[PDB]
Amino acid sequence: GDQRFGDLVFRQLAPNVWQHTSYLDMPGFGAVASNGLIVRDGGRVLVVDTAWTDDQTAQILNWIKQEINLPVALAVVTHAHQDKMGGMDALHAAGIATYANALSNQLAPQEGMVAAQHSLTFAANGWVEPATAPNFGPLKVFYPGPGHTSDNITVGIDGTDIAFGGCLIKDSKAKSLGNLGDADTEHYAASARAFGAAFPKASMIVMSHSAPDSRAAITHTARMADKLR
Ligand SMILES: S=c1[nH]nc(-c2cccnc2)n1C[C@@H]1CCCO1
Ligand SMILES: [Ca+2]
Ligand SMILES: [Ca+2]
Ligand SMILES: [Zn+2]
Ligand SMILES: [Zn+2]
């Protein structure tokens, strides 16, 4: 049921939701998948995360034009690392309004990423301040606290069973929390737990580097993170 367009793979998760997957061949690891989301919101499309590269990101947009044929209104990118923000220039060239955590945009230059056009800010309880996320339709943006990076954010899709943990959440059989080069090992477990509590009825948990899982991914990630303190 999965579809290939250029270097990208797409999988439909729900009537109005698809996962996009892009690959980069890394020293040491070889080919590494990274996943984001595409959401049809009535007459428009919303994107979560770029692909690794601008070329791959343009392939997402072309697949959307071909298969969905609705304007892409905006994209939310989930932290300032290549897998999630590598394709910003491609979104900007296509005229898609981009949104990231303020902190992602502040870190972006140091991390070699291009900042988004707009900054999301968050309350103490993690929820986006709504004036910063105008007309986000079903996307509910949550900052769960520092974990994979200090700026990692997460998104739930209202009206669906789906929530996206990005690179904070690992699958429920994972052996480790993977890339911890920029991680907050002290607060990781609470941040994983906070994402779970923010989206308490999501049953399909989508994440950057494994296929969609159940809520078990959340509790497994938190259990692994507990051992880093
Ligand atoms: S996660 C996360 N954050 N940054 C990156 C990344 C890594 C290497 C180069 N550019 C970005 N990754 C993904 C990989 C996945 C497993 C190893 O790290
Ligand atoms: Ca670029
Ligand atoms: Ca870094
Ligand atoms: Zn990262
Ligand atoms: Zn990642």
Numbering used by the authors: 42 to 270
From the primary publication:
BLs are categorised in two distinct families, according to their catalytic mechanism, and further divided into structural classes (Ambler’s classification): class A, C, and D serine β-lactamases (SBLs), which utilize a catalytic serine for β-lactam hydrolysis, and class B metallo-β-lactamases (MBLs), which, in turn, require divalent zinc ions for catalysis. Finally, subclass B1 MBLs inactivate nearly all β-lactam antibiotics, with the sole exception of monobactams. This class includes variants such as IMP-1, VIM-2 and NDM-1, whose worldwide emergence has characterized recent decades. Here, we present the identification of a series of non-covalent scaffolds targeting SBLs and concomitantly MBLs, through a large virtual screening study, in vitro validation, microbiological analysis and X-ray crystallography.
High-resolution structures of compounds 24 and 31 in complex with VIM-2 and NDM-1 MBL have been determined by single-crystal X-ray diffraction at 1.60 and 1.38 Å resolution, respectively. In the binary structures with NDM-1 compound 31 orients similarly to 24, with which it shares the same sulfhydryl-triazole moiety. With respect to 24 in VIM-2, compound 31 in NDM-1 is further stabilized by hydrophobic interactions formed with Ile28/35, Val67/73 and His263/250, and by a hydrogen bond with Gln119/123. The zinc ions maintain the position they have in the apo form, as well as the coordinating residues, i.e. His116/120, His118/122, Asp120/124, His196/189, Cys221/208, His263/250. In particular, in the case of NDM-1 they experience a slight opening upon binding of the inhibitors, while in VIM-2 their position appears quite conserved. For compound 31, the pose selected during the virtual screening was actually the one most similar to the crystallographic pose but was not the one that received the highest score in silico. It should be noted that the amide sidechain of Gln119/123 is flipped in the X-ray binary complex compared to the structure used for docking simulations, allowing it to interact with the ligand pyridyl nitrogen. We can observe a slight shift towards His196/189, possibly because of the flipped Gln119/123 or, alternatively, for the absence of water molecules in docking simulations. The highest ranking was, instead, assigned to a conformation of compound 31 having the opposite orientation with respect to the crystallographic one. The most potent compound is 31, which demonstrates an inhibition percentage of 97%.
